[PDB]
Design a protein around this ligand. Structure first.
Ligand SMILES: CCCCCCCCCCCCCCCCCC(=O)OC[C@H](COP(=O)([O-])OCC(O)COP(=O)([O-])OC[C@@H](COC(=O)CCCCCCCCCCCCCCCCC)OC(=O)CCCCCCCCCCCCCCCCC)OC(=O)CCCCCCCCCCCCCCCCC
Ligand SMILES: CCCCCCCCCCCCCCCCCC(=O)OC[C@H](COP(=O)([O-])OCC(O)COP(=O)([O-])OC[C@@H](COC(=O)CCCCCCCCCCCCCCCCC)OC(=O)CCCCCCCCCCCCCCCCC)OC(=O)CCCCCCCCCCCCCCCCC
Ligand SMILES: CCCCCCCCCCCCCCCCC[C@@H](O)O[C@H](CO[C@H](O)CCCCCCCCCCCCCCC)COP(=O)(O)OCC[N+](C)(C)C
Ligand SMILES: CCCCCCCC/C=C\CCCCCCCC(=O)OC[C@H](COP(=O)(O)OCCN)OC(=O)CCCCCCC/C=C\CCCCCCCC
Ligand SMILES: CCCCCCCC/C=C\CCCCCCCC(=O)O[C@H](COC(=O)CCCCCCC/C=C/CCCCCCCC)COP(=O)(O)OCCN
Ligand SMILES: CCCCCCCCCCCC(=O)SCCNC(=O)CCNC(=O)[C@H](O)C(C)(C)COP(=O)(O)O
Lengths: 104, 165, 88, 70, 128, 459, 175, 178, 124, 63, 84
């Protein structure tokens, strides 16, 4: 119903219908508020290929970036007290294996 | 917080333009408004500069730090490239808006009804103008630190946001 | 909005202004009632360009079925007044 | 709550001096703010801490032996 | 020559690209004339019943009544059990039920097995 | 409990001895007074129950249902006042008598210490509703609708009587207290399986369970407004109440018995919500929405967890109120248009703004907008189902999205757009209709302030 | 406030820093809180004192209800209905009390997390560990009972748990 | 909109419609006015070359490759006037349009306000009541037998007569009632 | 970056994996190995409750900066020197991390050179 | 004059009710209002106790 | 209070293609034997205050002169006050 003439003087301007005319079985499917079948400047198949192609390419590039990350020429960040053992979880009655940091 | 200010002001300028041209929204039918209506012009220019992370502007204190933090983090290369291209495209459509709305010859219908002389519009726009000029500095200098800074950086990596913009 | 309430005189003046800016038609010869094909010797393509110029002048667009049978400036003004509900 | 301005019909619209002076003042304020901030805080853009060259460091501080001890 | 436009179900063919409109015959003109004739008769009837000052009610529309009746009440008397209807009904009315039953049964069997083995870690799980 | 029952009985002689022009006023006033008396029952204890006598008890599961039942009658009278204007005094008195008898049967059903008394009243409610549907009905399909409504219920509930008499012959009692205290597990046996089916199917058919819901659209569409109100508000909750009362003896058989019904309800909520998207009738759409809500209530009862039970009680109350309001709005439109078709009367917000506000509030409440009790029940049941299995979340989310979709579709189709040109008999909304909508909607927003009143005995 | 017990709801001493102004600029916070005091806290205090004296003019009391202990389900006969009723009521009351104990522990945990700020992961180990014990106990006692819970089902669950524990202990000792 | 439609479109009308569509989309492509003037004059020159062609077959073969060329380069986002069926304000004010018969249901306290307006409305009602009875017979006598062949209505031919079916065309609410 | 290209287009074993660094013992280079120092204790650093990711070797300057920021409140730019000290200390930490990365890279270089030299000697 | 009555009926009255509601009813129950603990830096003193936090370990200051 | 002031249209003889890019358009059109029939209709867009344009860099540098002068004055005052 979206692609009906918007300049004809319909009895129902919003639905673009004429009194007494046969009504399409799926009228409530096409009420200009729902799926429409208006022709597009670009073909359906080309649109599908372009949309799908872009998405597939973006996903595969993101996976490649996961495989090949980016970082800086630095070592790991160092934290003083046994890698902050007491303030991360706690467990003060186990005496963990100490870790000591290398000064250069 | 920064985007709130400058994007709200950008919509204010767009709405003023739309109202002044008889509810016309398309940019193909708006031409030379830099002189025909200058307060909206300067507000939109300041908002566009703020949006593009111009130095010492509301958008600087957030967007520049975003770019710096993404550039020096163990993340995807693709995501970083997409972010840089997005920044370039941001500058690009800001330029598109300014060029097609303010620079050329007029393209609106002959009956000119352009008018800004209303105190409500001027005051509302100028309050957010002052915000989009100074709030970034004020808020950044008033809040306590919450993350480790990126003190030392390669020179080309420090300028990358400005270069792409 | 702040739109002045345009009148019939303004519509006629604007239509005649745009028509006099049309170099194909001589300014002296044209009259409110002057016909297009016969009184001024214009083509149908000239008529459709005149309709487009009216459309660009008044900021609203006329359907093709109505436009194709608008042949005088007087009835163009009448159509515009009927569309925009002009009193006087 | 504004003043009366009539349409112009194909001529440049009437402008109030107040809006012109306000726009010019605000643009000048924005540019002055940028210049003032760049003058007082230049390190916010160019940086303040030089980036060291890793290849320029001598092998002494890096704990390197001449390929024979270990 | 320019690349061709290929229509689909949800992107129909433009009116100006129909070869049918270019194949003009007197029969086609007569068909269009009688189509507009019946349309004009319907419009005349509607406007005559619409502009009447005496009418103070709803103009009953037989087309709307037929549409609703066919959509709601005319289905079953025209139903005939066919291989297509039987197969589609069986699929669309039985398949989802067994699919979801299999999915939920497998999930719950896995969860019960983990609970019996004791390796699920249900700490702080108080409300159920 | 007799302090409620006796005034309801005295409503009959008062109605039959009233003046020809004073039946509605007296009935409404005394029904409202009876409702006020019913409010005292809400006070409930965390302990066993309010055991008034050997015949009747009250509980925090029965109390909200009783309050809703007593509150519904004045609204039904207000709705029925309009279309019965050209009716003789005797027939109007008969209509009021049918409504009063239905209320009395429901009131005695909800207390019902003993299960055979519960069955007797649960079946006695069938006659006044049938008479109302098949006597004061507008269309010619009311007879077929009444036949469907009668025979579905009776076919479902006849094995329940045999199951109950067998249970009493074996155990020795059908008093709910003794049944609860002396409960024993059911062994996985074919006889026990069929006893479970006979105990469950009678309440399943009246929920209605998906696939056994055919009677509901017919009965709701062909009934007068008062009949639709009572059917959507109270009569659907009888099955849920019965299941909640009877699932105490069906353990541990219910753990695996529930799967066929759980799958049916979980898929049928999606099916009926999708059906609501393509519907040309307001009443049919509202009926199918009721089917979806009751299917989700069935899921809650079958899961059989405390959160499930609380959510089911809250959702039952909220759905009753919301469906009654929606049916009343549809009837207000119908009495003006006489069509009962969505697409005929359009853009009614321009002509009737306050009624459009009522439509918006009713649609928002049906959409389960927080913090309404509709969403309280919805969310409790969703959480319980997620604890039952993490995969239910997909179906629950699909149902929520489709529910919002068709609710706003129904709102937009009727209230927004351009008015129909040829319809010119749309008079301003009367004070009666506005008061009806207000009395439907205000209790919901007051109950959301005290949700513990409708969360059932497991709160 | 005496309205609640400090032992049931423990709080740290709440040590607070002292104002140490480093500059001569007058901060606005102190001036704003002084004007807030003058314009808000004084009339509110006066109204509260008036209401409190009006309450003191009419004083009356209410009492906590005490419940006696009754035999539990473990010492009730198979078909004895009266003792079963009493034991069921007692068990339901105990269930409510256990729920409220868990509520108290959860409130303690939430208050600790909010109060400790950025160091909550270390300074609230005690509350977390108490909540771990209480949740484990509560879970053992009442989980999986179902909607139709009773003292008999809880006793059956406890019985099977003790049978499993006894079997495990016997198998471990005889290993 | 106002004019009644015909059973079909002739070749000349279709050619005009394509010319208008092509000019509009060329203006949409060419934003600037001087560039649009240049390319529109070039379009007119390319367009009127086959003006004087005579036979029907080649004329029908033309306009068809023209429509295909138009569809290939149709500027998928053309400029649209705000009030057009695709504009940003197509049906913005349709919620403010109230029918005229709604005034018949106003309370007498409301009708006490605006007495002159309601007196004029009653005069209009009387005029319509007489004119309709005249119009029914006029249309009955004027219509061809077997039903109308087009949805075009005749004007009034007598002195006191009014155009048939005039009430709902004259009494439109407004373009912008509020 | 240049290390990204060297690793992903060149030899992966030639350069370290940042996830698993360092791959060599701290004393492999020289036996002195002076230890890093902490000025802020546990209790005061907990009381300042900076953040877990801010609880690094630079905590003392951060505590002093917060001391200013709390003390000279209305003058939100009074202590700029403390910000400078904190930034300088973080810069020193970062350049230490770069030195660690460079040292590990050259240790890997010399290691690989070692086993290829042994391979050449063995083949000879 | 319009602003003065507005500042009383729309700001002063609501803040009076809320302050009374918070100071005497909400805080009557425990844990209802929980406040983030104030930060403690070296060199500070406490009003309640009066003790002074010892200073830090005099780090080597340069640049 | 609305704008009812009887606005009068200018004279149609005022608009001339001369001095506008429309003249260049006509010069190009004449090389192919063509002419624009609507050339004078659009001449008002290049005639009055619309005759002068501003570049993008000039648009961005809208208030650079006054801001720069104020910055110079302020930095001079800062230098003359700090060196004391
Ligand atoms: C509750 C919640 C939701 C529930 C959802 C509700 C869904 C429930 C309803 C489901 C109903 C589906 C089955 C309907 C019965 C089918 C027969 C019928 O309807 O008669 C009409 C009709 C009889 O009419 P007729 O005059 O004999 O012939 C008319 C045909 O046009 C002439 O046809 P033909 O002569 O070409 O037939 C040849 C061939 C058909 O050849 C085929 O291509 C189909 C073979 C595959 O038939 C066969 O070979 C049989 C195999 O039967 C058919 O025509 C089709 C029969 C084949 C359909 C296969 C049945 C579908 C499978 C469903 C079984 C799955 C569950 C079954 C449970 C059973 C245990 C409890
Ligand atoms: C948010 C706090 C509000 C505090 C103020 C108190 C407001 C009292 C409202 C009492 C309940 C409303 C009764 C429903 C029928 C309305 C009667 C009517 O026709 O009005 C004509 C009257 C006269 O206008 P008119 O020109 O003659 O009529 C022309 C047309 O009617 C054209 O009229 P219209 O175009 O103006 O539309 C009518 C209007 C009125 O119609 C409505 O739709 C209002 C009802 C919305 C609720 C829908 C159900 C969703 C579940 C909510 C349940 C919570 C209830 C809480 C307890 C309620 C106690 C009764 O509809 C709306 O404005 C759109 C409503 C959409 C709002 C969505 C937000 C809802 C959730 C927000 C959370 C609430 C609790 C906060 C919890 C956290 C913070 C503590 O207009 C009004 O007075 C409007 C009513 C005020 C707006 C209410 C909006 C929020 C209030 C909801 C309940 C109170 C919340 C308690 C928290 C307080 C803190
Ligand atoms: C139509 C719209 C919906 C209406 C409502 C539908 C709901 C009713 C469905 C009834 C629920 C299931 C019934 C019985 C479930 C028990 C589980 C059993 O079926 O599964 C296997 C049973 O195996 C086989 O299924 C045996 C039964 C085969 C015969 C049944 C017919 C199958 C399809 C009939 C469906 C018709 C439904 C509609 C009737 C009009 C398990 O193997 P087994 O360990 O050995 O038996 C365990 C039970 N014991 C311990 C008592 C022995
Ligand atoms: C899951 C979603 C399943 C799909 C739901 C189908 C619902 C059908 C019923 C809707 C009613 C019909 C309707 O709404 O009309 C379509 C309506 C109108 O079209 P317009 O473009 O607005 O044109 C108007 C101008 N002419 O448009 C719509 O709103 C349809 C929207 C459908 C959305 C479906 C796509 C959703 C897919 C989501 C995939 C992404 C997943 C999220 C990623 C998150 C990662 C963390
Ligand atoms: C909407 C329509 C739904 C209609 C109801 C569908 C289900 C009906 C339930 C089954 C019918 C019989 C109910 C059984 C009555 C309870 C009595 C009982 O449980 O005792 C059993 C009796 O069990 C039976 O006898 C059952 C026999 C079944 C015969 C009737 C068949 C009716 C149809 C059965 C198939 C359909 C059931 C499900 C229908 C699905 C929905 C349509 C044991 O008997 P005893 O001999 O004393 O003890 C054994 C040790 N000596
Ligand atoms: C940007 C969009 C892309 C552009 C692509 C569009 C391609 C279009 C080019 C096609 C050129 C043609 O005309 S295709 C040629 C088709 N055949 C004829 O034109 C034969 C007779 N012509 C007429 O009758 C006309 O109406 C006329 C006499 C002009 C007016 O008449 P009036 O006296 O009644 O005004």
């Amino acid at each position: 119903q979206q692609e009906r003439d918007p300049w004809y003087d319909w009895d129902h301007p919003d639905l673009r219908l004429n009194w007494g005319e046969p009504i399409h079985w799926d009228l409530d499917m096409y009420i200009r508020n729902r799926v429409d079948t208006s022709p597009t400047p670009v073909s359906w198949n080309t649109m599908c290929k372009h949309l799908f192609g872009f998405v597939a390419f973006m996903l595969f590039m993101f996976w490649v970036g996961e495989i090949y990350p980016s970082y800086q020429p630095v070592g790991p960040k160092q934290y003083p007290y046994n890698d902050l053992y007491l303030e991360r979880g706690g467990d003060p009655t186990k005496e963990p294996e100490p870790v000591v940091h290398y000064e250069i | 917080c920064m985007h709130a200010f400058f994007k709200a002001m950008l919509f204010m300028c767009s709405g003023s333009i739309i109202h002044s041209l008889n509810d016309e929204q398309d940019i193909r039918k708006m031409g030379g408004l830099y002189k025909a209506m200058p307060f909206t012009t300067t507000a939109l220019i300041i908002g566009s500069l703020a949006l593009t992370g111009m130095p010492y502007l509301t958008g600087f204190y957030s967007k520049d730090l975003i770019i710096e933090a993404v550039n020096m983090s163990y993340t995807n290369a693709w995501a970083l490239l997409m972010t840089l291209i997005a920044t370039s495209l941001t500058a690009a459509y800001s330029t598109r808006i300014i060029f097609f709305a303010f620079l050329g010859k007029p393209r609106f219908p002959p009956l000119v009804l352009i008018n800004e002389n209303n105190p409500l519009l001027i005051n509302s726009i100028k309050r957010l103008l002052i915000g989009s000029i100074f709030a970034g500095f004020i808020i950044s200098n008033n809040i306590p630190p919450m993350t480790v800074p990126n003190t030392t950086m390669p020179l080309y990596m420090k300028m990358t946001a400005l270069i792409v913009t | 909005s702040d739109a002045p309430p345009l009148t019939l005189e303004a519509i006629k003046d604007r239509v005649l202004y745009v028509l006099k800016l049309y170099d194909k038609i001589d300014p002296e010869k044209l009259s409110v009632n002057s016909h297009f094909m016969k009184d001024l010797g214009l083509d149908s393509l000239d008529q459709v360009e005149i309709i487009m110029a009216m459309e660009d002048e008044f900021g609203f667009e006329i359907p093709d079925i109505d436009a194709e049978k608008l042949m005088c400036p007087q009835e163009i003004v009448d159509y515009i007044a009927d569309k925009k509900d002009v009193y006087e | 709550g504004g003043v009366h301005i009539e349409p112009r019909y194909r001529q440049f619209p009437q402008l109030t001096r107040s809006q012109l002076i306000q726009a010019e003042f605000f643009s000048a304020t924005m540019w002055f703010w940028i210049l003032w901030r760049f003058w007082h805080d230049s390190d916010a853009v160019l940086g303040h801490f030089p980036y060291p060259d890793p290849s320029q460091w001598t092998d002494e501080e890096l704990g390197i032996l001449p390929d024979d001890e270990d | 020559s320019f690349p061709k436009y290929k229509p689909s179900r949800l992107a129909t063919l433009p009116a100006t690209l129909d070869p049918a409109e270019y194949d003009i015959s007197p029969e086609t003109r007569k068909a269009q004339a009688e189509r507009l004739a019946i349309r004009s008769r319907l419009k005349r009837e509607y406007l005559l019943q619409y502009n009447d000052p005496n009418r103070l009610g709803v103009i009953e529309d037989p087309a709307l009544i037929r549409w609703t009746y066919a959509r709601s009440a005319n289905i079953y008397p025209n139903f005939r059990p066919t291989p297509k209807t039987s197969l589609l009904g069986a699929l669309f009315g039985i398949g989802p039920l067994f699919f979801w039953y299999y999915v939920f049964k497998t999930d719950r069997d896995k969860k019960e097995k983990l609970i019996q083995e004791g390796k699920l870690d249900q700490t702080f799980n108080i409300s159920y | 409990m007799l302090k409620i029952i006796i005034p309801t009985t005295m409503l009959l002689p008062m109605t039959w001895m009233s003046k020809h022009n004073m039946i509605w006023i007296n009935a409404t006033v005394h029904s409202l007074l009876i409702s006020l008396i019913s409010l005292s029952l809400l006070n409930q204890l965390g302990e066993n129950s309010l055991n008034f006598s050997l015949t009747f008890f009250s509980d925090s599961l029965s109390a909200p249902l009783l309050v809703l039942t007593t509150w519904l009658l004045p609204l039904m009278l207000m709705a029925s006042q309009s279309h019965l204007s050209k009716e003789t005094t005797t027939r109007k008195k008969l209509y009021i008598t049918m409504l009063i008898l239905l209320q009395l049967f429901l009131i005695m059903t909800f207390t019902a210490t003993e299960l055979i008394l519960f069955y007797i009243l649960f079946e006695a409610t069938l006659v006044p509703t049938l008479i109302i549907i098949t006597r004061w009905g507008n269309q010619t399909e009311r007879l077929n609708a009444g036949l469907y409504f009668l025979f579905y219920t009776l076919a479902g509930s006849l094995p329940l009587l045999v199951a109950l008499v067998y249970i009493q012959n074996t155990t020795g009692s059908l008093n709910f207290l003794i049944i609860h205290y002396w409960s024993h597990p059911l062994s996985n046996s074919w006889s026990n399986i069929f006893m479970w089916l006979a105990c469950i199917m009678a309440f399943m058919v009246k929920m209605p369970l998906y696939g056994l819901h055919l009677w509901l659209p017919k009965a709701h569409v062909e009934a007068p407004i008062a009949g639709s109100m009572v059917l959507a508000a109270v009569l659907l909750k009888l099955g849920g109440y019965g299941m909640m009362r009877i699932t105490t003896i069906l353990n541990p058989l219910t753990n695996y018995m529930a799967y066929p019904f759980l799958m049916l309800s979980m898929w049928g909520m999606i099916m009926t919500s999708s059906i609501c998207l393509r519907q040309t009738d307001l009443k049919s759409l509202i009926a199918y929405s009721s089917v979806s809500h009751m299917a989700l209530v069935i899921v809650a009862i079958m899961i059989q967890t405390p959160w499930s039970f609380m959510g089911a009680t809250a959702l039952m109350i909220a759905h009753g109120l919301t469906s009654s309001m929606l049916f009343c709005l549809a009837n207000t439109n119908y009495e003006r248009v006489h069509s009962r078709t969505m697409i005929l009367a359009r853009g009614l917000q321009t002509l009737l703004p306050l009624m459009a506000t009522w439509w918006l509030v009713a649609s928002l409440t049906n959409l389960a907008l927080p913090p309404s009790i509709n969403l309280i029940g919805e969310l409790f049941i969703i959480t319980a189902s997620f604890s039952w299995s993490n995969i239910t979340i997909i179906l629950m989310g699909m149902n929520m999205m489709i529910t919002a979709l068709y609710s706003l579709y129904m709102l937009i189709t009727t209230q927004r757009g351009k008015y129909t040109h040829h319809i010119n008999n749309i008079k301003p909304s009367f004070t009666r209709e506005n008061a009806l909508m207000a009395l439907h909607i205000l209790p919901l927003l007051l109950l959301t302030l005290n949700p513990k009143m409708i969360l059932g005995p497991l709160y | 406030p005496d309205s609640w017990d400090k032992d049931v709801y423990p709080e740290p001493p709440r040590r607070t820093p002292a104002p140490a102004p480093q500059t001569s600029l007058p901060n606005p916070v102190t001036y704003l809180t002084k004007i807030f005091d003058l314009l808000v806290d004084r009339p509110v205090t006066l109204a509260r004192e008036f209401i409190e004296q009006q309450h003191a003019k009419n004083r009356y009391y209410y009492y906590h209800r005490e419940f006696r202990r009754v035999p539990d389900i473990t010492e009730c006969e198979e078909k004895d209905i009266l003792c079963m009723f009493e034991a069921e009521m007692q068990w339901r009351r105990d269930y409510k009390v256990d729920q409220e104990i868990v509520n108290i522990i959860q409130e303690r945990l939430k208050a600790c997390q909010q109060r400790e700020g950025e160091s909550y992961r270390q300074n609230c180990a005690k509350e977390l560990e108490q909540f771990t014990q209480v949740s484990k106990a509560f879970q053992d006692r009442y989980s999986d009972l179902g909607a139709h819970y009773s003292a008999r089902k809880c006793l059956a669950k406890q019985k099977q748990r003790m049978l499993a524990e006894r079997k495990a202990a016997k198998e471990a000792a005889a290993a | 909109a106002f004019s009644a439609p015909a059973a079909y479109l002739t070749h000349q009308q279709k050619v005009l419609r394509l010319y208008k569509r092509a000019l509009r989309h060329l203006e949409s492509w060419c934003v600037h006015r001087d560039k649009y003037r240049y390319f529109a004059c070039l379009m007119r020159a390319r367009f009127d070359e086959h003006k004087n062609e005579k036979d029907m077959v080649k004329a029908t073969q033309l306009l068809r490759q023209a429509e295909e060329e138009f569809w290939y380069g149709q500027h998928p986002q053309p400029y649209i006037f705000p009030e057009s069926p695709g504009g940003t304000s197509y049906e913005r004010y349709e919620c403010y349009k109230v029918p005229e018969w709604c005034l018949d249901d106003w309370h007498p306290s409301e009708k006490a306000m605006y007495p002159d307006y309601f007196a004029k409305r009653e005069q209009w009602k009387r005029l319509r009541r007489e004119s309709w009875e005249r119009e029914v017979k006029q249309l009955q006598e004027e219509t061809p037998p077997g039903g109308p062949r087009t949805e075009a209505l005749p004007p009034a031919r007598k002195e006191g007569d009014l155009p048939p079916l005039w009430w709902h065309i004259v009494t439109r609410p407004r373009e912008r009632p509020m | 970056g240049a290390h990204l290209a060297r690793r992903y287009l060149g030899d992966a074993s030639k350069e370290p994996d940042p996830l698993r660094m360092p791959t060599f013992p701290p004393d492999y280079g020289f036996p002195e190995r002076k230890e890093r120092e902490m000025v802020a204790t546990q209790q005061e650093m907990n009381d300042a409750q900076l953040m877990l990711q801010q609880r690094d070797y630079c905590a003392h300057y951060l505590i002093q900066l917060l001391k200013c920021k709390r003390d000279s409140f209305p003058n939100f730019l009074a202590c700029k020197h403390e910000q400078h000290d904190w930034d300088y200390c973080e810069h020193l930490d970062y350049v230490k991390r770069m030195k660690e990365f460079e040292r590990e890279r050259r240790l890997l270089q010399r290691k690989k050179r070692r086993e290829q030299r042994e391979a050449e000697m063995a083949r000879g | 004059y319009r602003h003065s009555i507005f500042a009383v009926t729309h700001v002063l009255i609501p803040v009076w009710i809320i302050h009374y509601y918070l100071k005497y009813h909400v805080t009557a129950k425990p844990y209802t209002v929980v406040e983030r603990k104030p930060r403690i830096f070296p060199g500070d003193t406490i009003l309640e106790t009066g003790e002074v936090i010892p200073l830090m370990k005099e780090f080597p200051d340069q640049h | 209070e609305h704008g009812h002031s009887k606005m009068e249209l200018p004279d149609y003889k005022q608009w001339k293609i001369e001095g506008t890019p429309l003249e260049t358009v006509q010069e190009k059109l004449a090389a192919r034997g063509l002419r624009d029939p609507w050339g004078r209709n659009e001449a008002w867009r290049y005639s009055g205050g619309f005759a002068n344009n501003v570049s993008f860099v000039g648009a961005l540098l809208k208030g650079f002169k006054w801001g720069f002068a104020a910055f110079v004055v302020a930095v001079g005052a800062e230098y003359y006050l700090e060196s004391q």
